From Swiss-Prot:
Locations listed in the record: Host cytoplasm
Region (Disordered): 1-113
Protein name: Host translation inhibitor nsp1
Job description of the protein: Inhibits host translation by associating with the open head conformation of the 40S subunit. The C-terminus binds to and obstructs ribosomal mRNA entry tunnel. Thereby inhibits antiviral response triggered by innate immunity or interferons. The nsp1-40S ribosome complex further induces an endonucleolytic cleavage near the 5'UTR of host mRNAs, targeting them for degradation. This inhibits the integrated stress response (ISR) in the infected cell by preventing EIF2S1/eIF2-alpha phosphorylation upstream of stress granule formation and depletes host G3BP1.
Domain (CoV Nsp1 globular) ranges: 2-113
Highest taxon, organism lineage: Viruses
Segment of the intact protein contained: 11 to 125 of 7096
Length: 113
């Protein structure tokens, strides 16, 4: 399937134990996609002070369209030193590894895979 329905645990930035997916744009996009497939991916909602508390490169989910079965269609964009790799809509949040942190919410997304 080009798209996969996922429910992503929304984590508080200060609970996150593993604050990024790796050390290159290509690695963080790779790792993010692997974690999304494996159900081991969290989502942090981006506000003032969040991104400086996580590790670059960042992996964003961004709205790719205007929402089947309650799932917003999203795609991945990475960012490293202020340059983005990909082009998409509004940020739903920043992806991080999920290693058993308790979420505050779930974000239903349709991931273009």
């Amino acid at each position: 399937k080009t798209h996969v329905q996922l429910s992503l645990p929304v984590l508080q930035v200060r609970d996150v134990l593993v604050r990024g997916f790796g050390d290159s744009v290509e690695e963080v996009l790779s790792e993010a996609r692997q974690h999304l497939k494996d159900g081991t991916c969290g989502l942090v909602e981006v506000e003032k002070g969040v991104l400086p508390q996580l590790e670059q490169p960042y992996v964003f989910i961004k709205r790719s369209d205007a929402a089947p079965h309650g799932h917003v269609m999203v795609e991945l964009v990475a960012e490293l030193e202020g340059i983005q790799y990909g082009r998409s809509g509004e940020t739903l949040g920043v992806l991080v590894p999920h290693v058993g942190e308790i979420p505050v919410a779930y974000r239903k997304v349709l991931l273009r895979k």
